[PDB]
Design a binder for these strands. Structure first.
Lengths: 131, 136, 195, 84, 88, 164
RNA sequence: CCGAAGGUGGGACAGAUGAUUGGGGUGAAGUCGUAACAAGGUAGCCGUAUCGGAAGGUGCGGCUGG
RNA sequence: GGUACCUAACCAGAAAGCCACGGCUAACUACGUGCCAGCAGCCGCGGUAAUACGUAGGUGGCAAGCGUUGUCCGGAAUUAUUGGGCGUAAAGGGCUCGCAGGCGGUUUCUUAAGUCUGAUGUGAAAGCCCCCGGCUCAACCGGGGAGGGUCAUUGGAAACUGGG
RNA sequence: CGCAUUAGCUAGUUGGUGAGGUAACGGCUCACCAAGGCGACGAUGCGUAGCCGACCUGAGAGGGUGAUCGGCCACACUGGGA
């Protein structure tokens, strides 16, 4: 069943935000690894680590609460659901909260961010809003 | 619902019914059928000119003229202003206006029409009720 | 047309002077010298919109089309609309100092002719581009009204330069909105035409 | 001066039962005007097999051509993958 | 058949003509094959604009202009190139 | 933090409802006013007040409004980013607008955003039209707003690495 | 030979209209009861059968929305 | 068609009306009427002190236009892809097994149907939009460009969807 | 483009061979065979409608319209023919 695991990892990060948990295990497909690498390099995460194992592997996330109790990530969203996939052209790539958020968009040359896909001027699957 | 359910059943849009249906039709004489014309006004012949009353709390006697139209339908229309030319068997031009108070009545007789004379003693609200600029 | 009456109703000096509000600052009429009530949000938008359109005497067809043309430009919207009504030729004539009102500057364009870059313009709504030397022909060269408005001295605004004898009004870069009007609150009128 | 190129498809044979012809399901598939999701449609064409080199369940390409009869407008190019 | 011809554009009292390669069959404002630039009659000065190479391309495939379009070609000087082409 | 109320405030009101309570004798009425109070430099608040009279109710509403104040980011005299405020079947989106538009908003939303000092808002109410829940919905949407400097400090980042 | 119209026939569909008829709605402070709302004076409702001027009653089973 | 156009003579002289004014909705008093006449889009007024009726004054809106009607669209997120729901308000089939259909855990290779990108043709002219020009300005015209295709042909990518 | 309270519709219809016809391939027309063809991705039937560039509205997605101008179509008192 499970019907898509990317939306499930985004809700797992969101529930760890709302509980204010500090670590997460996520079952780590390769696109999940690249998403967490993007969220690492954009400062939404402290650090991300991989646990390569026998079942499917584990990726662990260290949620970043920079000040007193401040969820840097307020909300997540999945755009292309498995049953309505969404694809944006390069002159339609959405820039979110105009600059203050971001959209994870996996084009033909690497799983890119907003600015990366904008500077490479290509579009593909549009698979996360990250606020 | 779901997207596949939206693909195979769709969103069915809500039905629109007109507020004034006797204006919303027409008639051709030899085809013997009942065309959809959607017309603003209709002249028709009065079949009964009386007066009768509304239903509930508002209680003041209304005006009530009954007109048979060019599509064939008898409707009770309303004559708003004070003092009318009209008799039975009078040619009457009808515009669309709902009278909430009297039930069954949803049209106005155009005042200033082909035979509906302009109203008596009026200087304010000139264009409604038909009257010309009197003198000054 | 009183047109003092418009000023005391709107509560603003539409000339901008001690006249027309002294001795009678209330609006008009039998319900005027009593304490009238303050207006709503709708009333505030009507106040600012009608301040501006009764300054310039515009019908709302032309007033909306100039609102739209200011929208066709870039930048801030209500500033550009101020700029378009301060490029209007009756306003250019009244800010060169050739009239005591904007009706007199309208009548200069209507019959008591005034000339732009040559032949003539009989039309007040002419948007005036920069660089345009505006003067009068040798028929109406110096008659009683232009003589009076030369004797009376207004300020020339910094988006204009005006000569006495040669009477050519020339321009500069753009009329900045610090210079234009202190009393009219823009961007309540943009909100009024946003609806 | 090379002449103009004709339209080309690939598809899949439904039936062999017509004399020297087949019908071909092209499964190119496209999205909506409104909901945007991408749904499938099967388009079966009548195509001429002059050698009768077809089988039920055969992926085949077809080229367009002159109208070969009523409802026939297609012919074979390259029978790619055979049925088992 | 094929004719390089003026094509009426403009307001009521102020005509305008686009020099337009159309057929004699087709209506005057109607369908047309391709265009070269323009013709202002109602200007008090000049201002004809001819493309000067695609009009020449249509003259040689066979497209005979009407008289006013021909003498506009002569005024801009494309008919001298066409007579030089016949001298070629 | 709790905003100390020592500022200059303009204190205009949204509604006064007449609000009844039935006793053995009959109806006993009060006036429940809610008033939005704030300067136009980035501090907004609102408050409810109930009394037998209208002006004492407005007094208590202005006092409780000065008690509860909120802050609003004015990035380029607008709001920084589009947000939906969702207090309880009142949902109101707020877009930044261009610099000429003015506050395009309905009554209590318009009162909040004009007494906020924010000048250029596109906005829309996607829910019920009671004044109380619309003002609560706006302040839910204005509490969750974010400054680009503080979010750049949150991401271990710089402003130009976000804003461009 | 094909062939429009016409002719004959039995159907199919569609609109008017029809003695008479059945329920529905809306309407005056009409008549008969008071079924429901409280333990509404027999807790109510749901399904089903039956009976009864009528709301309804009663049986069986279910529900608490006692 | 002595038509646009230009110039001179004469007199403020020839030239302003329509709708509304409780709230929505900017704009109010008086007299008459007295659940009558009537108003009304809605809440609903009016039964002798009517800012809701009729008149007069006033005010407000626009303006050679104004108002009503009829139909579209908006408001209506009240058909919701953007943008709604289903314990009790409308709304979970009495419940199952399953055909078609829809959706598919992981790693890897390849393909290129989907996706994105380049080039070419093309989506006529006029129209909407941008930039300039001419009609007394403007509408309109004119010029130049942009725009609008899941469009056709052609070439790359292989992350993702599908195929193997 | 609306209806499933329209679920089955076809028999020159669906293919073949041969002939004829047409500017031309072709059930376009005829002979002879085969039992085929279209179909829940909505056939058939009924109802409505000239289609479009465009026009009105809308923040847009959309919804409505198909006057003028322009492209294509169809018709010419009704049906058939050359």
């Amino acid at each position: 069943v499970m019907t898509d695991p990317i939306a499930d990892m985004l809700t797992r990060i969101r529930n760890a935000n709302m509980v204010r948990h500090e670590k997460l295990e996520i079952p780590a497909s390769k696109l999940k690894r690249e998403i967490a690498e993007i969220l690492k390099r954009e400062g939404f995460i402290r650090d991300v680590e991989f646990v390569e194992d026998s079942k499917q592997g584990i990726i662990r996330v260290f949620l970043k609460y920079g000040q007193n109790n401040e969820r840097v990530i307020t909300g997540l969203k999945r755009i292309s659901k498995p049953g309505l996939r969404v694809y944006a052209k390069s002159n339609e790539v959405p820039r979110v909260l105009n600059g203050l958020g971001i959209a994870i968009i996996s084009t033909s040359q690497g799983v890119l961010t907003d600015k990366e896909a904008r500077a490479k001027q290509a579009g593909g699957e549009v698979l996360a809003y990250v606020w | 619902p779901t997207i596949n359910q939206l693909i195979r059943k769709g969103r069915v849009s809500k039905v629109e019914n007109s507020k004034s249906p006797a204006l919303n039709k027409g008639y051709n004489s030899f085809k013997k059928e009942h065309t959809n014309v959607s017309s603003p006004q209709k002249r028709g012949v009065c079949t009964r000119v009386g007066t009768m009353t509304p239903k509930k709390p508002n209680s003041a006697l209304r005006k009530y003229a009954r007109v048979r139209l060019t599509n064939g339908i008898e409707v009770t229309a309303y004559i708003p202003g004070i003092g009318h030319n009209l008799q039975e068997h009078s040619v009457v031009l009808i515009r669309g206006g709902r009278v909430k108070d009297l039930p069954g009545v949803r049209y106005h007789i155009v005042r200033g029409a082909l035979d509906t004379a302009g109203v008596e003693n009026r200087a304010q609200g000139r264009s409604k009720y038909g009257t010309k600029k009197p003198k000054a | 047309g009183p047109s003092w009456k418009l000023s005391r109703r709107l509560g603003i000096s539409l000339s901008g002077t001690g006249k027309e509000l002294e001795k009678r600052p209330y609006a008009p009429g039998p319900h005027g010298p009593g304490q009238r009530k303050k207006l709503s949000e709708y009333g505030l938008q009507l106040q600012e919109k009608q301040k501006l359109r009764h300054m310039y005497g515009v019908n709302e067809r032309q007033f909306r089309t100039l609102f739209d043309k200011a929208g066709k430009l870039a930048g801030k919207h209500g500033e550009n609309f101020m700029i378009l009504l301060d490029s209007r030729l009756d306003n250019v004539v009244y800010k060169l100092g050739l009239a005591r009102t904007r009706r007199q500057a309208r009548q200069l364009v209507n019959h008591g002719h005034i000339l732009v870059d040559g032949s003539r313009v009989d039309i007040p709504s002419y948007l005036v581009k920069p660089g345009q030397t505006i003067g009068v022909r040798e028929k109406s060269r110096n008659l009683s009204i232009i003589k009076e408005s030369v004797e009376v001295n207004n300020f020339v605004p910094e988006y204009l330069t005006f000569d006495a004898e040669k009477l050519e009004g020339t321009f500069t870069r753009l009329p900045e909105r610090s210079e234009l009007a202190p009393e009219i609150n823009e961007a309540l009128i943009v909100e009024f035409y946003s609806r | 001066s090379e002449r103009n190129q004709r339209k080309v498809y690939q598809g899949r044979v439904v039936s062999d039962k017509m004399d020297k012809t087949i019908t071909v399901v092209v499964e190119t598939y496209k999205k909506h005007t409104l909901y945007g999701k991408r749904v499938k449609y099967s388009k079966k064409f009548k195509a001429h097999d002059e050698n009768n080199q077809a089988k039920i369940g055969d992926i085949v390409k077809i080229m367009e051509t002159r109208p070969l009869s009523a409802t026939k407008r297609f012919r074979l190019v390259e029978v790619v993958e055979e049925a088992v | 058949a094929v004719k390089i011809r003026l094509k009426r554009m403009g307001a009521k009292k102020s005509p305008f003509y686009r020099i337009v390669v159309a057929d004699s069959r087709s209506p005057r404002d109607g369908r047309f094959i391709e265009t070269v630039g323009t013709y202002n009659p109602v200007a008090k000065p000049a201002e004809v604009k001819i493309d000067e190479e695609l009009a020449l391309k249509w003259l040689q495939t066979g497209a005979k202009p009407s008289d006013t379009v021909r003498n506009l070609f002569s005024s801009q000087g494309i008919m001298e190139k066409f007579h030089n082409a016949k001298q070629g | 933090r709790i905003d100390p109320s020592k500022l200059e405030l303009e204190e205009r009101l949204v509604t006064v409802n007449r609000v009844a309570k039935v006793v053995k004798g009959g109806r006993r009425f009060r006036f429940a006013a809610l008033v939005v109070v704030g300067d136009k430099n980035g501090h907004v608040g609102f408050g409810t007040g109930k009394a037998q009279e209208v002006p004492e109710a407005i007094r208590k509403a202005v006092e409780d409004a000065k008690k509860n104040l909120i802050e609003v980011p004015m990035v380029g005299t607008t709001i920084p980013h589009e947000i939906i405020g969702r207090f309880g079947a009142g949902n109101i989106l707020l877009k930044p607008a261009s610099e000429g538009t003015g506050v395009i908003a309905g009554g209590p939303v318009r009162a909040v955003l004009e007494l906020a000092g924010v000048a250029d808002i596109l906005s829309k109410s996607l829910g019920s039209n009671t004044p109380i829940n619309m003002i609560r919905a706006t302040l839910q949407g204005l509490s969750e707003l974010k400054r680009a400097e503080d979010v750049a400090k949150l991401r271990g980042k710089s402003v130009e690495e976000l804003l461009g």
